[PDB]
Amino acid sequence: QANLMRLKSDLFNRSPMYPGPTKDDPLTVTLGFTLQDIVKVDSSTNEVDLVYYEQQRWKLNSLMWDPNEYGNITDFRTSAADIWTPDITAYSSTRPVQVLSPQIAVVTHDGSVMFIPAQRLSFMCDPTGVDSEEGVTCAVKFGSWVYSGFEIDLKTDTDQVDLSSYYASSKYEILSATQTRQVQHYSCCPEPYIDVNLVVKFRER
Amino acid sequence: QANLMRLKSDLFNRSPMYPGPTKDDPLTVTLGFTLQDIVKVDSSTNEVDLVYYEQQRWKLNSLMWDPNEYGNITDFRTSAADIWTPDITAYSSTRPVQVLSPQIAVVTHDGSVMFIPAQRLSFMCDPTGVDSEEGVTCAVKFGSWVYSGFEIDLKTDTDQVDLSSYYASSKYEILSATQTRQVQHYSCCPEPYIDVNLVVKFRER
Amino acid sequence: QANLMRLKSDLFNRSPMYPGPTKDDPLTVTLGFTLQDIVKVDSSTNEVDLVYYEQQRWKLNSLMWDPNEYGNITDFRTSAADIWTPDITAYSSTRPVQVLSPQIAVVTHDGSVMFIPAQRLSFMCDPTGVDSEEGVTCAVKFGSWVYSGFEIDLKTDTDQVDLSSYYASSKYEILSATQTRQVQHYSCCPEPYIDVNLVVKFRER
Amino acid sequence: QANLMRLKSDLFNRSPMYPGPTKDDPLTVTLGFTLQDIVKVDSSTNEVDLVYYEQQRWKLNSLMWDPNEYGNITDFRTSAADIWTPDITAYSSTRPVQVLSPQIAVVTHDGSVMFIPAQRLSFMCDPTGVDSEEGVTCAVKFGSWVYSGFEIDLKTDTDQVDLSSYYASSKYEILSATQTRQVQHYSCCPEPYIDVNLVVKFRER
Amino acid sequence: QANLMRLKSDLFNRSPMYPGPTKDDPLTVTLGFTLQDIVKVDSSTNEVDLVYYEQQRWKLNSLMWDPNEYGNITDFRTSAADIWTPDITAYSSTRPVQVLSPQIAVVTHDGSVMFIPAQRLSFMCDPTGVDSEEGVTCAVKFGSWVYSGFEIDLKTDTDQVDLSSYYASSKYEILSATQTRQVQHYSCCPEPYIDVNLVVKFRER
Numbered sequence A, B, C, D, E: 001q002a003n004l005m006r007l008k009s010d011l012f013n014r015s016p017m018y019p020g021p022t023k024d025d026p027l028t029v030t031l032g033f034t035l036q037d038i039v040k041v042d043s044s045t046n047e048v049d050l051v052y053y054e055q056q057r058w059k060l061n062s063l064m065w066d067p068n069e070y071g072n073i074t075d076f077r078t079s080a081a082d083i084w085t086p087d088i089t090a091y092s093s094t095r096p097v098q099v100l101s102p103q104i105a106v107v108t109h110d111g112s113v114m115f116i117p118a119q120r121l122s123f124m125c126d127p128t129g130v131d132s133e134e135g136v137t138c139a140v141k142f143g144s145w146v147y148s149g150f151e152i153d154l155k156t157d158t159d160q161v162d163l164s165s166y167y168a169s170s171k172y173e174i175l176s177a178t179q180t181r182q183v184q185h186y187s188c189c190p191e192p193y194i195d196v197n198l199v200v201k202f203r204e205r
């Protein structure tokens, strides 16, 4: 405990806080989804409700330490309030995201961070035809709200959404689920913004 | 990071906070809407629910810096809590506005600020006739709750609401959408208050 | 800005906070309502939902300044958290009040304050007969929860509720709307408590 | 104001906070209910919703003062955050309690405190038969969640719930309403826990 | 009170906060459930709502004291904010958990802690067949969100859920209710995570 207390104190009390990524020092965030449930479909508003875990990974030089100086500690858990976290946002939500998991991340000695918030999201999707064999397809993009591709880039480790925790007695069965990097351009703004597009194809069970 | 950390520290730790606009030093806020979805209509309460992005722009001398003194930094992202933001409020809401995007703004070296909150709003609107060819028209005014025209003025860059991110499979298609500056007077209060009136004409798709 | 920054600092950093009104130094609060909408009626729970602005006015010696010492500033806007505000409470609500406007007040050099929160309120009201010509009458009292008449008194400027921003396409039209000072006595407590009784008579449009 | 400011400062800035009651220094809390409305009944979930005021009284030596030293002040109003309050909790709620009144208490020079929170509570109750002449009976216990009888005891001034503010046009009329001290024992825990059991018998009006 | 004030001050003001469990200093948390009500079932979303108390127990060397040095005090109640608490999380919730009891724990002189939060939980469960003699079975896992088995292990005192406070007039009667330790492995992560699996079998009464 003494060694971890020292490490956290050296990292968090001494530092002026990380001011986010910049054009000179950009950052790549890795995203992965594990889809747990399609809870609800609303055909009168074209809203669909998902429950998933969003795995986020990034790496900061300012979170590095030498494990030899801190009793061989290679990593630790810490409150997400102690650190910067990326502003990854759904581009087509219809409600504030509801947070289902404790806001705690894992920091590793090389400065890498893993953060896995569980969320419930309502987003724009037309479920008409969900009761057929073909099913429906729906999509929602996730990216930084405020940082362009020149400050935050995204990648995935796989294009396959993790379906191994999908609720087996859901009202909806999943036919496929992909997560794919894209580049968007907007009327408001000159620079490209990066997203990962979660595409889910499903039907009634 | 070092240069941005310095800049933020020089702007935000040293300063007593900006105390808002005054009659002697008034401010013009530019507003623009991009309408994403008419999610829901309630014909038993005459409430309609929109999802949009509200682009806000203003400029303060106290947020100026010389980029040459801070490693050629011309702009940065920062939490909206670090700065003053205008109290732009819908005049006919029926619920607290729900915030859908991170509360982060962009500050530029000339002291100009851009802030683009995504919101879901329930407001007063009679949807009777939405299922016809003619459709319905509805309106909501946005302005400072507490500052008159002598402290906060508003303008738009265009009278055309941006419909280029409008959800193509919404239950409602948009026939027109305008945003127009107006001047209001109230029994309580001697001075004029400025608003931008969002007028949306729509029908079932 | 320099002069207002000084004024706010002199008023709020130097002061120990106002400890509320007392028997020795009582306060009169002026209340006025402007009724915007009867949004909803629930005949299975006898709850009705209003949207209104509640104009509050009072005066404290501790908020006085000489405008000559602060660049001729006669008034300013400030966050309601910076100052004491009266605990005016609906006596027959069925839900927490929802706040629809920014919590910002106007302080004037003589120590007078104006604060105008927009609220949505669910309160106890039997709507049976609302669909008739006679309509229904409902009532809700507003007063200090904790201060008697010997510490907080109330008055109105008029007994007529302001109907000039009433939503013209509401489901309910207003037949009359009054706001009247009353004195209540309770088993628990020896002293009188003051309220303003909002009486609204309405029917389907 | 000067004298009250001094008193509050002497009581709250100088003190280390009261650490709650103990076996060596136990406390008796007096409870009384005034029932305002049975708002809603849900026969598909067996939940019933009440609105009431819960009068709480207790006394601490650490809140004593000599009125002669503070300009003859015998009592004052203060925010409930300034002081310890008992953790009185409904034992069979189905939702977090909703608070309907300002969190402000009255402290008197002998160290006694009065606190009267207005609440809306959903609790476990089977309303089947509410539409008959006999009506239904329902019950909910209120006590400390964490303190046994050896640290917190309870009493009532009367076994009769105060029905003098009961909403006359409620959907439900009250046949009887009692509040009675009881002693409970639990598998988890060796000591007795005290409650006041609110028993309400009611039917459709 | 003097003695307890000293103890709390010595434990909480002097200490740098416990930084959670580690591989070098792991922790075992004991969990037990007492099921109070199955409130609601939603067959269109496959969500079920429970109300229960979750008894949590663990032990830290840094919370030890010698009762002889503090007036023979063997234990005390304190706010949960004063101490570390395990991040025990439902793995298949569909909404944020609603907290129904005060966030206060009991600390004992040997460093052991007891914490018993009452919760309402919506979780993934197919109620189809609940209206039959056989009923339905549903399950939800509870464990650390972020700590593996090498930092947080779990155990139960019994595999039998405590049904002695189960609401006798619930819509649903309980046929069986068990709580059983398990070990999970996830695609994201190399180490095992421990849970207690709450299995409830029930039907309409």
Ligand SMILES: C[C@@H]1C[C@@H]2[C@H]3Cn4c(cccc4=O)[C@@H](CN2C)[C@H]31
Pocket: A143, A144, A145, A146, A147, A186, A188, A189, A193, B053, B104, B106, B115, B116, B117
């Ligand atoms: C219309 C664009 C979509 C969304 C908006 C928010 N936004 C942007 C740039 C800078 C700051 C900012 O808040 C753009 C990119 N964002 C992902 C716009």
Ligand SMILES: C[C@@H]1C[C@@H]2[C@H]3Cn4c(cccc4=O)[C@@H](CN2C)[C@H]31
Pocket: B143, B144, B145, B146, B147, B186, B188, B189, B193, C034, C053, C104, C106, C115, C116, C117
């Ligand atoms: C009834 C008026 C509309 C709305 C209200 C709130 N308000 C005002 C002035 C100063 C402070 C203030 O809170 C007025 C202007 N506002 C836009 C009134």
Ligand SMILES: C[C@@H]1C[C@@H]2[C@H]3Cn4c(cccc4=O)[C@@H](CN2C)[C@H]31
Pocket: C143, C144, C145, C146, C147, C186, C188, C189, C193, D053, D104, D106, D115, D116, D117
């Ligand atoms: C039953 C009374 C109604 C309401 C309650 C709250 N209250 C009071 C006195 C002191 C403090 C206080 O909280 C009384 C006056 N208030 C307006 C009681």
Ligand SMILES: C[C@@H]1C[C@@H]2[C@H]3Cn4c(cccc4=O)[C@@H](CN2C)[C@H]31
Pocket: D143, D144, D145, D146, D147, D186, D188, D189, D193, E034, E053, E104, E106, E115, E116, E117
């Ligand atoms: C199952 C029991 C009912 C409730 C629970 C919470 N509780 C207790 C003791 C100490 C701390 C504590 O949180 C007991 C008494 N409480 C009123 C248990």
Ligand SMILES: C[C@@H]1C[C@@H]2[C@H]3Cn4c(cccc4=O)[C@@H](CN2C)[C@H]31
Pocket: A034, A053, A104, A106, A114, A115, A116, A117, E143, E144, E145, E146, E147, E186, E188, E189, E193
């Ligand atoms: C998909 C896994 C389930 C859940 C998630 C959250 N989580 C984990 C490890 C480290 C940090 C973290 O936040 C894993 C274990 N947890 C119980 C994943």
Ligand SMILES: *[C@@H]1O[C@H](CO)[C@@H](O)[C@H](O)[C@H]1NC(C)=O
Pocket: B071, B072
């Ligand atoms: C800033 O601008 C000049 C001119 O382009 C450049 O050569 C210089 O190296 C820059 N300074 C820093 C610290 O990046």
Ligand SMILES: *[C@@H]1O[C@H](CO)[C@@H](O)[C@H](O)[C@H]1NC(C)=O
Pocket: D071, D072
């Ligand atoms: C306070 O005490 C008594 C109360 O009757 C009174 O005679 C005296 O005038 C009061 N004095 C002050 C300074 O308040």
Ligand SMILES: *[C@@H]1O[C@H](CO)[C@@H](O)[C@H](O)[C@H]1NC(C)=O
Pocket: E071, E072
């Ligand atoms: C504590 O216990 C001892 C006996 O074990 C006793 O002598 C002492 O008086 C006790 N503490 C008190 C009275 O505070």
